[PDB]
mmCIF file of C-alpha atoms and ligand atoms in Angstrom:
data_model
loop_
_atom_site.group_PDB
_atom_site.id
_atom_site.type_symbol
_atom_site.label_atom_id
_atom_site.label_comp_id
_atom_site.label_asym_id
_atom_site.label_seq_id
_atom_site.Cartn_x
_atom_site.Cartn_y
_atom_site.Cartn_z
ATOM 1 C CA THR A 1 30.704 18.404 1.825
ATOM 2 C CA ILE A 2 28.948 21.262 -0.538
ATOM 3 C CA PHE A 3 26.475 20.923 -3.108
ATOM 4 C CA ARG A 4 27.466 24.356 -3.708
ATOM 5 C CA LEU A 5 28.008 27.504 -2.457
ATOM 6 C CA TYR A 6 25.951 30.643 -3.005
ATOM 7 C CA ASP A 7 26.636 33.703 -2.256
ATOM 8 C CA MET A 8 29.774 35.338 -0.229
ATOM 9 C CA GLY A 9 30.054 38.274 1.592
ATOM 10 C CA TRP A 10 32.406 40.731 3.734
ATOM 11 C CA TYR A 11 29.856 41.641 6.059
ATOM 12 C CA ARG A 12 30.628 43.670 8.508
ATOM 13 C CA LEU A 13 26.973 44.529 4.625
ATOM 14 C CA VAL A 14 30.183 45.682 2.821
ATOM 15 C CA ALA A 15 29.449 44.487 -0.489
ATOM 16 C CA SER A 16 28.705 40.911 -1.049
ATOM 17 C CA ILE A 17 29.499 38.796 -4.687
ATOM 18 C CA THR A 18 27.379 36.731 -5.433
ATOM 19 C CA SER A 19 27.567 33.724 -7.715
ATOM 20 C CA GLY A 20 27.724 36.323 -10.715
ATOM 21 C CA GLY A 21 28.322 38.964 -9.921
ATOM 22 C CA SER A 22 25.502 41.184 -9.515
ATOM 23 C CA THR A 23 24.261 43.205 -6.799
ATOM 24 C CA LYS A 24 28.119 45.428 -6.314
ATOM 25 C CA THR A 25 37.070 33.816 -9.591
ATOM 26 C CA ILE A 26 34.387 31.418 -8.954
ATOM 27 C CA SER A 27 34.646 27.713 -7.586
ATOM 28 C CA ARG A 28 32.626 24.439 -8.602
ATOM 29 C CA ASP A 29 32.219 21.142 -6.517
ATOM 30 C CA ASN A 30 29.856 18.742 -6.076
ATOM 31 C CA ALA A 31 40.226 46.376 10.974
ATOM 32 C CA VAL A 32 38.720 42.991 12.027
ATOM 33 C CA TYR A 33 36.569 41.590 9.213
ATOM 34 C CA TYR A 34 34.798 38.438 8.781
ATOM 35 C CA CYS A 35 33.492 37.458 5.558
ATOM 36 C CA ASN A 36 29.552 35.398 5.565
ATOM 37 C CA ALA A 37 28.368 32.514 3.164
ATOM 38 C CA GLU A 38 25.321 31.045 2.701
ATOM 39 C CA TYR A 39 25.257 27.170 0.969
ATOM 40 C CA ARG A 40 23.554 23.571 0.998
ATOM 41 C CA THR A 41 25.210 20.265 1.519
ATOM 42 C CA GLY A 42 22.616 18.928 -1.017
ATOM 43 C CA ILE A 43 19.929 18.989 -2.858
ATOM 44 C CA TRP A 44 17.079 18.149 -0.458
ATOM 45 C CA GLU A 45 18.553 20.148 2.887
ATOM 46 C CA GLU A 46 17.195 23.715 3.119
ATOM 47 C CA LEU A 47 19.161 27.026 3.282
ATOM 48 C CA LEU A 48 21.636 27.461 6.092
ATOM 49 C CA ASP A 49 25.109 30.301 6.414
ATOM 50 C CA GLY A 50 28.017 29.762 7.853
ATOM 51 C CA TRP A 51 30.309 32.410 9.682
ATOM 52 C CA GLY A 52 34.033 32.041 9.143
ATOM 53 C CA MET B 1 3.014 -27.606 9.901
ATOM 54 C CA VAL B 2 6.092 -25.993 10.053
ATOM 55 C CA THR B 3 5.935 -24.850 5.819
ATOM 56 C CA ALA B 4 2.250 -24.218 6.554
ATOM 57 C CA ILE B 5 2.045 -22.489 9.468
ATOM 58 C CA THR B 6 5.639 -20.130 8.196
ATOM 59 C CA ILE B 7 3.281 -19.465 5.455
ATOM 60 C CA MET B 8 -0.309 -18.029 7.227
ATOM 61 C CA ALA B 9 2.059 -16.484 9.574
ATOM 62 C CA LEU B 10 3.202 -13.880 6.859
ATOM 63 C CA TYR B 11 -0.402 -14.166 5.594
ATOM 64 C CA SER B 12 -0.999 -12.945 9.474
ATOM 65 C CA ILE B 13 1.586 -10.603 9.618
ATOM 66 C CA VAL B 14 1.213 -8.042 6.257
ATOM 67 C CA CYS B 15 -2.620 -7.994 6.070
ATOM 68 C CA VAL B 16 -2.087 -6.868 10.376
ATOM 69 C CA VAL B 17 0.313 -4.573 9.020
ATOM 70 C CA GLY B 18 -1.317 -3.795 6.206
ATOM 71 C CA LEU B 19 -4.607 -2.518 7.932
ATOM 72 C CA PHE B 20 -3.152 -0.671 10.266
ATOM 73 C CA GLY B 21 -0.986 1.405 9.292
ATOM 74 C CA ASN B 22 -3.339 1.852 6.258
ATOM 75 C CA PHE B 23 -6.258 3.292 8.810
ATOM 76 C CA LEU B 24 -3.853 4.885 11.173
ATOM 77 C CA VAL B 25 -2.866 7.128 7.233
ATOM 78 C CA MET B 26 -6.755 7.583 7.754
ATOM 79 C CA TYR B 27 -7.165 9.217 10.589
ATOM 80 C CA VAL B 28 -4.965 10.861 11.412
ATOM 81 C CA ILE B 29 -5.203 12.111 7.288
ATOM 82 C CA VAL B 30 -8.937 13.236 8.396
ATOM 83 C CA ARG B 31 -8.537 14.075 12.294
ATOM 84 C CA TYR B 32 -6.313 16.868 12.249
ATOM 85 C CA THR B 33 -6.948 20.207 9.500
ATOM 86 C CA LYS B 34 -3.272 20.908 9.456
ATOM 87 C CA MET B 35 -2.648 17.918 7.074
ATOM 88 C CA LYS B 36 -5.128 18.624 4.606
ATOM 89 C CA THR B 37 -2.825 19.774 2.090
ATOM 90 C CA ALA B 38 -3.316 19.293 -2.204
ATOM 91 C CA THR B 39 -0.445 15.975 -1.453
ATOM 92 C CA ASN B 40 -2.143 14.537 1.387
ATOM 93 C CA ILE B 41 -5.079 13.644 -0.403
ATOM 94 C CA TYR B 42 -3.487 12.281 -3.430
ATOM 95 C CA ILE B 43 -1.594 9.820 0.220
ATOM 96 C CA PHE B 44 -4.719 9.162 1.374
ATOM 97 C CA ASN B 45 -6.028 7.963 -2.067
ATOM 98 C CA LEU B 46 -2.846 5.436 -2.127
ATOM 99 C CA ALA B 47 -3.907 3.925 1.271
ATOM 100 C CA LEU B 48 -7.097 3.989 0.057
ATOM 101 C CA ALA B 49 -5.824 1.829 -3.500
ATOM 102 C CA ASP B 50 -3.385 -0.481 0.117
ATOM 103 C CA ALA B 51 -5.541 -1.572 1.959
ATOM 104 C CA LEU B 52 -8.121 -1.979 -0.371
ATOM 105 C CA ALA B 53 -5.633 -4.644 -1.510
ATOM 106 C CA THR B 54 -5.006 -5.929 1.500
ATOM 107 C CA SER B 55 -8.062 -6.136 2.621
ATOM 108 C CA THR B 56 -7.890 -9.007 0.341
ATOM 109 C CA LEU B 57 -5.060 -11.207 1.952
ATOM 110 C CA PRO B 58 -7.064 -13.336 4.885
ATOM 111 C CA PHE B 59 -9.056 -15.054 2.175
ATOM 112 C CA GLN B 60 -6.087 -16.548 0.518
ATOM 113 C CA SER B 61 -5.544 -17.428 3.522
ATOM 114 C CA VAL B 62 -8.444 -18.993 4.131
ATOM 115 C CA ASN B 63 -8.237 -20.754 0.343
ATOM 116 C CA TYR B 64 -4.265 -21.616 0.221
ATOM 117 C CA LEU B 65 -5.347 -24.748 3.880
ATOM 118 C CA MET B 66 -8.550 -25.382 2.692
ATOM 119 C CA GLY B 67 -8.262 -25.940 -0.873
ATOM 120 C CA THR B 68 -11.579 -24.920 -2.111
ATOM 121 C CA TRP B 69 -12.828 -21.069 -1.990
ATOM 122 C CA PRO B 70 -15.821 -21.149 -0.203
ATOM 123 C CA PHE B 71 -17.070 -17.602 0.136
ATOM 124 C CA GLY B 72 -18.968 -18.867 -3.460
ATOM 125 C CA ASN B 73 -19.284 -16.172 -6.452
ATOM 126 C CA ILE B 74 -19.480 -12.307 -5.093
ATOM 127 C CA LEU B 75 -16.848 -11.980 -3.045
ATOM 128 C CA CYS B 76 -14.931 -14.443 -5.746
ATOM 129 C CA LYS B 77 -16.106 -11.811 -7.720
ATOM 130 C CA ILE B 78 -14.961 -7.886 -5.708
ATOM 131 C CA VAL B 79 -11.354 -10.212 -4.742
ATOM 132 C CA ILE B 80 -10.423 -10.280 -8.347
ATOM 133 C CA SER B 81 -12.233 -7.286 -9.675
ATOM 134 C CA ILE B 82 -10.360 -5.678 -6.081
ATOM 135 C CA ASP B 83 -6.432 -6.334 -7.678
ATOM 136 C CA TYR B 84 -6.780 -4.569 -10.856
ATOM 137 C CA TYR B 85 -8.366 -1.703 -9.066
ATOM 138 C CA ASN B 86 -5.070 -1.727 -6.451
ATOM 139 C CA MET B 87 -2.425 -2.224 -9.978
ATOM 140 C CA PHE B 88 -4.153 0.681 -11.887
ATOM 141 C CA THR B 89 -4.973 3.151 -8.563
ATOM 142 C CA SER B 90 -1.602 2.357 -7.246
ATOM 143 C CA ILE B 91 0.249 3.688 -10.296
ATOM 144 C CA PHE B 92 -2.016 6.395 -11.836
ATOM 145 C CA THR B 93 -1.770 8.249 -8.208
ATOM 146 C CA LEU B 94 1.886 7.940 -8.138
ATOM 147 C CA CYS B 95 1.541 9.197 -11.022
ATOM 148 C CA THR B 96 -0.321 11.537 -10.460
ATOM 149 C CA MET B 97 1.150 13.427 -7.371
ATOM 150 C CA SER B 98 4.246 13.600 -9.398
ATOM 151 C CA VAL B 99 2.218 16.010 -12.141
ATOM 152 C CA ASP B 100 1.298 17.698 -8.506
ATOM 153 C CA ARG B 101 4.532 18.471 -7.052
ATOM 154 C CA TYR B 102 6.585 19.239 -10.757
ATOM 155 C CA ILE B 103 4.152 21.783 -11.038
ATOM 156 C CA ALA B 104 4.321 22.330 -6.928
ATOM 157 C CA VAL B 105 8.171 23.398 -7.446
ATOM 158 C CA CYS B 106 8.728 24.588 -11.132
ATOM 159 C CA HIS B 107 6.177 26.848 -11.958
ATOM 160 C CA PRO B 108 5.583 28.432 -8.384
ATOM 161 C CA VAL B 109 3.138 31.437 -9.293
ATOM 162 C CA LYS B 110 0.175 29.088 -11.439
ATOM 163 C CA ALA B 111 0.650 26.260 -8.814
ATOM 164 C CA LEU B 112 -0.324 29.206 -5.543
ATOM 165 C CA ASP B 113 -3.428 29.547 -8.731
ATOM 166 C CA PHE B 114 -4.916 25.569 -8.408
ATOM 167 C CA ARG B 115 -3.615 23.690 -5.810
ATOM 168 C CA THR B 116 -6.522 23.677 -3.849
ATOM 169 C CA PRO B 117 -7.975 20.771 -1.645
ATOM 170 C CA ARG B 118 -10.965 21.369 -3.526
ATOM 171 C CA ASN B 119 -9.573 20.521 -6.375
ATOM 172 C CA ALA B 120 -7.192 17.035 -5.939
ATOM 173 C CA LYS B 121 -10.945 15.783 -4.715
ATOM 174 C CA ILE B 122 -11.956 15.532 -8.557
ATOM 175 C CA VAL B 123 -8.821 14.514 -10.229
ATOM 176 C CA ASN B 124 -9.233 12.231 -6.846
ATOM 177 C CA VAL B 125 -12.687 10.333 -8.397
ATOM 178 C CA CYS B 126 -11.426 11.558 -12.485
ATOM 179 C CA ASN B 127 -8.916 8.833 -11.158
ATOM 180 C CA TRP B 128 -10.866 6.110 -9.640
ATOM 181 C CA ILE B 129 -13.190 6.567 -12.796
ATOM 182 C CA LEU B 130 -10.988 5.783 -15.116
ATOM 183 C CA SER B 131 -9.453 2.497 -13.530
ATOM 184 C CA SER B 132 -12.909 1.500 -12.468
ATOM 185 C CA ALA B 133 -14.232 1.616 -16.426
ATOM 186 C CA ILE B 134 -11.100 -1.254 -16.782
ATOM 187 C CA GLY B 135 -11.481 -2.250 -13.125
ATOM 188 C CA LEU B 136 -15.719 -3.528 -13.957
ATOM 189 C CA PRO B 137 -14.917 -6.031 -16.961
ATOM 190 C CA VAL B 138 -13.197 -8.042 -15.234
ATOM 191 C CA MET B 139 -15.782 -8.112 -12.517
ATOM 192 C CA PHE B 140 -16.959 -8.857 -15.230
ATOM 193 C CA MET B 141 -16.165 -12.012 -16.853
ATOM 194 C CA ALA B 142 -14.835 -13.072 -12.769
ATOM 195 C CA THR B 143 -16.274 -16.379 -12.229
ATOM 196 C CA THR B 144 -16.093 -19.561 -9.844
ATOM 197 C CA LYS B 145 -15.450 -22.738 -11.898
ATOM 198 C CA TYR B 146 -16.066 -26.472 -10.584
ATOM 199 C CA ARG B 147 -12.613 -28.352 -11.230
ATOM 200 C CA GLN B 148 -11.529 -31.816 -11.047
ATOM 201 C CA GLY B 149 -10.437 -31.163 -7.187
ATOM 202 C CA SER B 150 -11.015 -28.267 -5.638
ATOM 203 C CA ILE B 151 -13.458 -25.185 -6.880
ATOM 204 C CA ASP B 152 -11.086 -22.301 -7.915
ATOM 205 C CA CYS B 153 -11.839 -18.307 -9.146
ATOM 206 C CA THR B 154 -11.039 -17.872 -12.366
ATOM 207 C CA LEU B 155 -10.986 -15.893 -15.191
ATOM 208 C CA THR B 156 -12.776 -16.801 -17.638
ATOM 209 C CA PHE B 157 -12.496 -15.642 -21.947
ATOM 210 C CA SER B 158 -15.812 -16.071 -23.392
ATOM 211 C CA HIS B 159 -15.661 -16.143 -26.872
ATOM 212 C CA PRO B 160 -11.929 -17.109 -27.821
ATOM 213 C CA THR B 161 -10.569 -17.876 -24.751
ATOM 214 C CA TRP B 162 -7.041 -16.692 -26.914
ATOM 215 C CA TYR B 163 -7.746 -13.732 -27.766
ATOM 216 C CA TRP B 164 -8.640 -11.919 -25.310
ATOM 217 C CA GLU B 165 -6.356 -13.328 -22.828
ATOM 218 C CA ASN B 166 -2.981 -11.926 -24.801
ATOM 219 C CA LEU B 167 -4.983 -8.436 -24.954
ATOM 220 C CA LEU B 168 -5.322 -8.288 -21.726
ATOM 221 C CA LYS B 169 -1.737 -9.196 -21.512
ATOM 222 C CA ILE B 170 -0.362 -6.154 -23.086
ATOM 223 C CA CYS B 171 -3.557 -3.510 -22.248
ATOM 224 C CA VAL B 172 -1.912 -3.850 -18.554
ATOM 225 C CA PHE B 173 1.914 -3.387 -19.225
ATOM 226 C CA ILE B 174 1.912 -0.895 -21.791
ATOM 227 C CA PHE B 175 -0.144 1.033 -20.707
ATOM 228 C CA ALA B 176 0.549 0.758 -16.408
ATOM 229 C CA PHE B 177 4.092 1.450 -16.949
ATOM 230 C CA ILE B 178 4.581 3.908 -20.261
ATOM 231 C CA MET B 179 2.366 6.408 -19.419
ATOM 232 C CA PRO B 180 2.571 6.678 -15.916
ATOM 233 C CA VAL B 181 6.848 5.662 -15.954
ATOM 234 C CA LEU B 182 7.682 7.614 -18.619
ATOM 235 C CA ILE B 183 5.364 10.811 -17.063
ATOM 236 C CA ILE B 184 7.134 10.739 -13.808
ATOM 237 C CA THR B 185 10.123 9.965 -15.537
ATOM 238 C CA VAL B 186 9.981 13.673 -16.960
ATOM 239 C CA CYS B 187 8.341 15.288 -13.877
ATOM 240 C CA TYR B 188 11.169 14.420 -12.335
ATOM 241 C CA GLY B 189 14.086 14.957 -14.722
ATOM 242 C CA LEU B 190 12.325 18.246 -14.596
ATOM 243 C CA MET B 191 11.921 18.962 -10.561
ATOM 244 C CA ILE B 192 15.534 18.074 -10.261
ATOM 245 C CA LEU B 193 17.375 20.379 -13.222
ATOM 246 C CA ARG B 194 14.870 23.159 -11.316
ATOM 247 C CA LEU B 195 15.918 22.497 -7.738
ATOM 248 C CA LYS B 196 19.715 22.362 -8.118
ATOM 249 C CA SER B 197 20.330 25.458 -9.651
ATOM 250 C CA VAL B 198 17.918 27.692 -7.571
ATOM 251 C CA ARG B 199 19.098 29.798 -4.311
ATOM 252 C CA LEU B 200 15.216 29.863 -2.757
ATOM 253 C CA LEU B 201 11.635 28.423 -4.001
ATOM 254 C CA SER B 202 9.215 30.859 -2.937
ATOM 255 C CA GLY B 203 11.424 33.614 -1.107
ATOM 256 C CA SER B 204 11.628 32.303 1.758
ATOM 257 C CA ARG B 205 14.292 29.273 3.601
ATOM 258 C CA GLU B 206 10.994 27.718 5.091
ATOM 259 C CA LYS B 207 9.298 27.338 2.570
ATOM 260 C CA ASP B 208 12.355 25.867 0.605
ATOM 261 C CA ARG B 209 12.597 23.405 2.841
ATOM 262 C CA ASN B 210 9.289 22.325 3.264
ATOM 263 C CA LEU B 211 8.683 21.915 -0.505
ATOM 264 C CA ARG B 212 12.601 19.310 -0.825
ATOM 265 C CA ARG B 213 11.473 17.392 1.827
ATOM 266 C CA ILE B 214 7.982 16.274 0.133
ATOM 267 C CA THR B 215 9.298 15.933 -3.228
ATOM 268 C CA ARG B 216 11.590 13.835 -1.288
ATOM 269 C CA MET B 217 9.383 11.802 0.706
ATOM 270 C CA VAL B 218 7.311 11.126 -2.705
ATOM 271 C CA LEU B 219 10.229 10.002 -4.525
ATOM 272 C CA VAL B 220 11.377 7.428 -2.647
ATOM 273 C CA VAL B 221 8.039 5.863 -3.148
ATOM 274 C CA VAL B 222 7.661 5.711 -6.252
ATOM 275 C CA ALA B 223 11.000 3.865 -6.061
ATOM 276 C CA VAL B 224 9.641 1.667 -2.992
ATOM 277 C CA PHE B 225 7.272 1.506 -5.986
ATOM 278 C CA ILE B 226 8.122 -0.170 -8.874
ATOM 279 C CA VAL B 227 11.319 -1.555 -6.737
ATOM 280 C CA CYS B 228 8.457 -3.792 -5.966
ATOM 281 C CA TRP B 229 6.197 -3.926 -9.050
ATOM 282 C CA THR B 230 8.675 -4.391 -11.057
ATOM 283 C CA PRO B 231 9.608 -8.874 -11.227
ATOM 284 C CA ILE B 232 6.066 -9.703 -11.871
ATOM 285 C CA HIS B 233 4.631 -7.085 -14.634
ATOM 286 C CA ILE B 234 8.575 -8.487 -16.461
ATOM 287 C CA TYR B 235 7.321 -12.000 -15.017
ATOM 288 C CA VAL B 236 4.000 -12.415 -17.082
ATOM 289 C CA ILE B 237 5.648 -10.660 -19.908
ATOM 290 C CA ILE B 238 8.122 -13.664 -20.128
ATOM 291 C CA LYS B 239 6.100 -16.357 -19.430
ATOM 292 C CA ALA B 240 3.206 -15.015 -21.934
ATOM 293 C CA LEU B 241 6.085 -14.988 -25.318
ATOM 294 C CA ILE B 242 8.876 -16.170 -24.241
ATOM 295 C CA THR B 243 7.771 -19.996 -23.054
ATOM 296 C CA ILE B 244 9.579 -21.057 -20.041
ATOM 297 C CA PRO B 245 9.098 -24.604 -19.007
ATOM 298 C CA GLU B 246 8.576 -26.496 -15.563
ATOM 299 C CA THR B 247 11.894 -25.790 -13.450
ATOM 300 C CA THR B 248 11.982 -26.814 -9.431
ATOM 301 C CA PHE B 249 13.484 -23.226 -9.136
ATOM 302 C CA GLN B 250 11.377 -21.255 -12.109
ATOM 303 C CA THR B 251 7.806 -21.675 -9.803
ATOM 304 C CA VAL B 252 9.067 -20.299 -6.517
ATOM 305 C CA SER B 253 10.600 -17.650 -8.316
ATOM 306 C CA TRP B 254 7.471 -16.753 -9.371
ATOM 307 C CA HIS B 255 5.305 -16.708 -5.477
ATOM 308 C CA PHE B 256 7.891 -14.798 -4.517
ATOM 309 C CA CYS B 257 7.412 -12.065 -6.793
ATOM 310 C CA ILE B 258 3.907 -12.445 -6.364
ATOM 311 C CA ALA B 259 4.488 -12.034 -3.046
ATOM 312 C CA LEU B 260 7.028 -8.899 -3.715
ATOM 313 C CA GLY B 261 3.382 -7.217 -5.620
ATOM 314 C CA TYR B 262 1.467 -7.975 -2.124
ATOM 315 C CA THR B 263 4.052 -7.345 0.057
ATOM 316 C CA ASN B 264 4.167 -3.197 -1.488
ATOM 317 C CA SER B 265 1.575 -1.869 0.188
ATOM 318 C CA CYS B 266 3.019 -2.752 3.768
ATOM 319 C CA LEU B 267 5.923 -0.990 3.385
ATOM 320 C CA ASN B 268 4.325 3.102 2.054
ATOM 321 C CA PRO B 269 3.228 3.681 6.094
ATOM 322 C CA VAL B 270 6.414 2.957 7.827
ATOM 323 C CA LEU B 271 7.729 5.734 4.692
ATOM 324 C CA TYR B 272 5.759 7.808 5.464
ATOM 325 C CA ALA B 273 6.064 6.672 9.535
ATOM 326 C CA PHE B 274 9.173 8.873 9.792
ATOM 327 C CA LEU B 275 9.454 10.617 5.776
ATOM 328 C CA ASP B 276 7.878 13.009 7.634
ATOM 329 C CA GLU B 277 8.032 15.029 10.301
ATOM 330 C CA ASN B 278 4.522 15.896 11.040
ATOM 331 C CA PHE B 279 3.676 12.084 10.692
ATOM 332 C CA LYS B 280 5.629 10.624 13.338
ATOM 333 C CA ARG B 281 4.653 13.612 15.541
ATOM 334 C CA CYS B 282 1.548 12.272 15.118
ATOM 335 C CA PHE B 283 1.412 9.478 15.238
ATOM 336 C CA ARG B 284 3.408 9.299 18.214
ATOM 337 C CA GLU B 285 0.629 12.096 20.157
ATOM 338 C CA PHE B 286 -2.159 9.805 18.990
HETATM 339 C C1 LIG C 1 -4.815 -15.004 -13.829
HETATM 340 N N1 LIG C 1 -5.678 -15.421 -12.619
HETATM 341 C C2 LIG C 1 -5.518 -14.373 -11.147
HETATM 342 O O1 LIG C 1 -5.471 -12.951 -11.511
HETATM 343 C C3 LIG C 1 -5.709 -14.471 -10.060
HETATM 344 C C4 LIG C 1 -6.672 -13.220 -9.160
HETATM 345 C C5 LIG C 1 -7.078 -14.183 -7.877
HETATM 346 C C6 LIG C 1 -7.995 -15.763 -7.427
HETATM 347 C C7 LIG C 1 -8.132 -15.676 -6.600
HETATM 348 C C8 LIG C 1 -8.128 -15.053 -5.416
HETATM 349 C C9 LIG C 1 -8.604 -15.294 -4.207
HETATM 350 C C10 LIG C 1 -7.166 -13.294 -5.801
HETATM 351 O O2 LIG C 1 -7.216 -12.711 -5.487
HETATM 352 C C11 LIG C 1 -7.013 -10.944 -5.024
HETATM 353 C C12 LIG C 1 -6.895 -12.946 -6.888
HETATM 354 N N2 LIG C 1 -4.680 -14.602 -8.980
HETATM 355 C C13 LIG C 1 -3.127 -15.517 -9.670
HETATM 356 O O3 LIG C 1 -3.266 -16.454 -8.943
HETATM 357 C C14 LIG C 1 -2.186 -15.245 -8.267
HETATM 358 S S1 LIG C 1 -2.989 -14.560 -6.686
HETATM 359 C C15 LIG C 1 -3.431 -16.062 -5.547
HETATM 360 C C16 LIG C 1 -4.603 -16.793 -6.151
HETATM 361 C C17 LIG C 1 -5.425 -17.684 -5.631
HETATM 362 C C18 LIG C 1 -4.404 -18.501 -4.286
HETATM 363 C C19 LIG C 1 -4.810 -18.956 -3.427
HETATM 364 C C20 LIG C 1 -3.769 -20.319 -2.514
HETATM 365 C C21 LIG C 1 -2.846 -19.572 -2.522
HETATM 366 C C22 LIG C 1 -2.186 -19.354 -2.773
HETATM 367 C C23 LIG C 1 -3.204 -17.909 -4.213
HETATM 368 C C24 LIG C 1 -2.861 -16.609 -4.558
HETATM 369 C C25 LIG C 1 -0.702 -16.966 -4.243
HETATM 370 C C26 LIG C 1 0.419 -17.081 -5.353
HETATM 371 N N3 LIG C 1 0.719 -17.083 -4.313
HETATM 372 C C27 LIG C 1 2.088 -15.966 -4.406
HETATM 373 C C28 LIG C 1 0.310 -15.444 -3.528
HETATM 374 O O4 LIG C 1 0.601 -14.816 -2.277
HETATM 375 C C29 LIG C 1 0.630 -14.240 -1.062
HETATM 376 C C30 LIG C 1 1.057 -13.352 -0.185
HETATM 377 C C31 LIG C 1 1.667 -14.304 0.676
HETATM 378 C C32 LIG C 1 2.458 -13.622 1.282
HETATM 379 C C33 LIG C 1 3.092 -12.552 1.336
HETATM 380 C C34 LIG C 1 2.219 -11.462 0.351
HETATM 381 C C35 LIG C 1 1.698 -12.195 -0.529
HETATM 382 C C36 LIG C 1 -0.928 -16.048 -4.344
HETATM 383 C C1 LIG C 2 -0.361 -7.556 -7.521
HETATM 384 C C2 LIG C 2 -0.877 -9.025 -7.417
HETATM 385 C C3 LIG C 2 -1.204 -10.275 -8.657
HETATM 386 N N1 LIG C 2 -1.479 -9.166 -9.917
HETATM 387 C C4 LIG C 2 -2.390 -9.767 -10.400
HETATM 388 C C5 LIG C 2 -3.174 -10.423 -11.552
HETATM 389 C C6 LIG C 2 -1.388 -10.764 -12.005
HETATM 390 C C7 LIG C 2 -0.545 -9.954 -13.667
HETATM 391 C C8 LIG C 2 -0.141 -8.625 -12.736
HETATM 392 C C9 LIG C 2 0.690 -7.859 -13.612
HETATM 393 C C10 LIG C 2 0.799 -8.711 -14.621
HETATM 394 C C11 LIG C 2 -0.987 -8.944 -15.774
HETATM 395 O O1 LIG C 2 -1.259 -9.462 -16.644
HETATM 396 C C12 LIG C 2 -1.343 -9.631 -14.130
HETATM 397 O O2 LIG C 2 -2.479 -11.464 -14.670
HETATM 398 C C13 LIG C 2 -2.198 -11.405 -13.507
HETATM 399 C C14 LIG C 2 -1.002 -12.731 -14.045
HETATM 400 O O3 LIG C 2 -1.728 -13.907 -14.530
HETATM 401 C C15 LIG C 2 -0.198 -13.074 -13.170
HETATM 402 C C16 LIG C 2 0.074 -12.701 -12.135
HETATM 403 C C17 LIG C 2 -1.218 -10.961 -11.203
HETATM 404 O O4 LIG C 2 -1.995 -12.315 -10.368
HETATM 405 C C18 LIG C 2 -0.547 -10.211 -10.305
HETATM 406 C C19 LIG C 2 0.428 -9.719 -11.534
#
């Protein structure tokens, strides 16, 4: 249900390994820790952040 | 009396709703400070041309029943001119709106430089002058005749009356699609290629949502205009060269297509009511 997910991370942020791998194994489709993501459902929809 | 007053009901419905929607659009755009934007001047011009088209429907309403055009010569000239201003300016404002949205999306640094509402007024006046240069010769040669039964309005092509007619038909078809439709297709083809792979457009999420909603609204309005106006243009050309015979369904289809072309002016304020949140709030609060 996701147009594309852009950034993913193990925020606590320890390190965010984004869609290219910068700011230092990819999917194409149209000590307690948590991993966040950012995505938009479609082209015209605003970016929104999801927590796991 | 059934089908007759049915057709007059359609005239009254379409004219009243178009005039009310476009007057409300102009009222809310001018009376609010937050609506003065580079892409609300274009909408104001669009709902100016639509109201100009819709204001001639009561005269056709009177002309249908009596069978005679009883308003004289000047009003006939004005109505025939207003039709071509409607068609040309409604197709050029959408093209300039799409190129504006292209500049906004794919060229942010440049679009920050020159997108003030001072520029939009000059583009609107230049567009209206360019349209009027072609729409004034139509008023040059439109007159009320004296037919056998009832007087009617008509375009009197002066010297050969076979050459200028086809020249006007070919010119209107070639220009009022192949320039603006090709420009619009290229502009939105570039916009979608940018919008697919961009994380954020202006660096802020709110600016991202506000920049994508307006582009979606403009694309929906362009699609509505093209779908409403394509069949009459293609059907005029097919009647021009194919030489279709006289059939019981053919005349009704022709008058449907022309009715759709006039009916497109009604829809746009309704689309703006629930495609833009600020327009909906201003309509409700007003
Ligand atoms: C080369 N000839 C021209 O170009 C003149 C240009 C022209 C001529 C005369 C006038 C008054 C004018 O006003 C804009 C334009 N125009 C035409 O050939 C065709 S337009 C016309 C014109 C006079 C008419 C007189 C009586 C009845 C129908 C007339 C219709 C008409 C025909 N078919 C459909 C229709 O739609 C109504 C409608 C009702 C409800 C919802 C939507 C639309 C209206
Ligand atoms: C917006 C609807 C009225 N249109 C103005 C002129 C005309 C027209 C249109 C499109 C292309 C033409 O060459 C043309 O001349 C006319 C014709 O002979 C058919 C119906 C139209 O009244 C109609 C749309």
